Design a protein. Structure first.
Length: 446
């Protein structure tokens, strides 16, 4: 089936675009660079962990790593007479009396590889600019969803798809050669504009060519090709430790695909029943998008062994798919989706209380939440279709699914900023959103 495998290749290659930020933008441990410190450390012979104890401001109470990460002692390390046992001890009764300055010379990053964070110095006061890398992508998705389908209706469908695939490949390759952060953000926007349109076009063609007897099965194979793409990403991110190398490796396969070759907006709100259904479907699409992206970003930000945690988290999407497929036939849709929302809400709630050393439990609860949101996302793709009649379904699917893009725009600032107010607070949001999405589902008909 030559035509099937190539669209499954087009579905697999989408996953690195959505989730690759986990590997391209990791933050290692850092502290200010200081002159003379290296020379003194060589003369006195400090070991690598001892140099910190003598040189970098301590954590103190409540962690407060800020004083080590973003400040330095204004001490004349060129002084020859300093004690090789503890050089600061002569200067004041307590190190807290010393003057602090900012990292005027730069940061020292403890990593053998590299990331956009380490190259553009997206730390301390600039640390909010990492959130804009994912927000620009989701904004591009939002504009693409409204524009590209109309362009494909005005222009020829085949030439349109061929053009947007050539533009997606070329923009993905050029981003690896980005000379600065601005250009990288413009390539990330131009890639966002086309990626999701291509993915939806391929899905449309695959379910249109295939008959109604197998549409659900080919849809589930299309979603499983995304999981295969995630496992390939996981393996390449392991063998290629540099971000530009991984961006090239991820981009080049797309060139091989090229080488192989009336409704009206007012209707959705005109009646209170259709309004109710529309607002509920909008809310569930929003909630599930926010939770799916939020849990992956939280795991990337917080896991201590990201490679195996990402591998085990990805594989669990296979039983989730088979369970959804069987449940659709045996049971229904309202109660299975309520239960799968409630399960992810409860897993997010329990994760607040787990002791940080119970990692072997923490991964189990993370996998249970992942499987829950996977089953719920699979269910809503069916429920969203039959609640709208065919006269409006082509529009109504676009309308309700667009909330996924505003959720993706908002999510990065929640995970990265709000965590600095209090580290539990994002999980409290995810718990409340999931436990409200559980109850609201029961108000839909069946």
């Amino acid at each position: 089936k030559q035509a099937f495998l190539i669209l499954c290749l087009l579905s697999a290659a989408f996953a690195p675009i959505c989730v690759g930020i986990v590997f391209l933008g990791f933050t290692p441990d850092h502290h200010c660079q200081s002159p003379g410190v290296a020379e003194l450390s060589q003369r006195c012979g400090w070991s690598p962990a001892e140099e910190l104890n003598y040189t970098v401001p301590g954590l103190g109470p409540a962690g407060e790593a800020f004083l080590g990460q973003c400040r330095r002692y204004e001490v004349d390390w060129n002084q020859s007479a300093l004690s090789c046992v503890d050089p600061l001890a002569s200067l004041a009764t307590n190190r807290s009396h010393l003057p602090l300055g900012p990292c005027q010379d730069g940061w020292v990053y403890d990593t053998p590889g590299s990331s956009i964070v380490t190259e553009f110095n997206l730390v301390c006061a600039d640390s909010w600019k990492l959130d804009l890398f994912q927000s620009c992508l989701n904004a591009g998705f939002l504009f693409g969803s409204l524009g590209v389908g109309y362009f494909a209706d005005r222009f020829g469908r085949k030439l349109c798809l061929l053009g947007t695939v050539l533009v997606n490949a070329v923009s993905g390759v050029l981003m690896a050669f980005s000379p600065n952060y601005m250009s990288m953000l413009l390539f990330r926007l131009l890639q966002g504009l086309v990626s999701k349109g291509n993915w939806m076009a391929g899905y449309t063609l695959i379910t249109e060519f295939v008959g109604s007897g197998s549409r659900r099965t080919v849809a589930i194979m299309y979603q499983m090709a995304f999981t295969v793409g995630l496992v390939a990403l996981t393996g390449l991110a392991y063998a290629l430790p540099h971000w530009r190398w991984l961006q090239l490796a991820v981009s080049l396969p797309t060139f091989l695909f090229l080488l192989y070759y009336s409704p009206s907006f007012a209707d959705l709100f005109r009646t209170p029943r259709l309004r109710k259904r529309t607002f509920i479907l909008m809310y569930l699409w929003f909630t599930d998008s926010v939770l799916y992206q939020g849990l992956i970003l939280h795991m990337g930000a917080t896991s201590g062994n990201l490679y195996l945690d990402f591998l085990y988290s990805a594989l669990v999407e296979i039983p989730g798919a088979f369970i959804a497929l069987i449940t659709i036939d045996r049971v229904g849709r309202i109660y299975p989706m309520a239960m799968s929302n409630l399960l992810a809400g409860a897993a997010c709630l329990v994760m607040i209380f787990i002791s940080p050393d119970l990692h072997w439990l923490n991964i189990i609860i993370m996998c249970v939440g992942r499987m829950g949101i996977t089953i719920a996302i699979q269910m809503i793709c069916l429920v969203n279709a039959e609640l709208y009649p065919t006269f409006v379904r082509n529009l109504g699917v676009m309308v309700c699914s667009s909330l996924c893009d505003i959720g993706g725009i908002i999510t990065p600032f929640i995970v990265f900023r709000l965590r600095e107010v209090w580290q539990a607070l994002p999980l409290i949001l995810f718990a409340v959103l999931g436990l409200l999405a559980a109850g609201v589902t029961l108000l839909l008909p069946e």
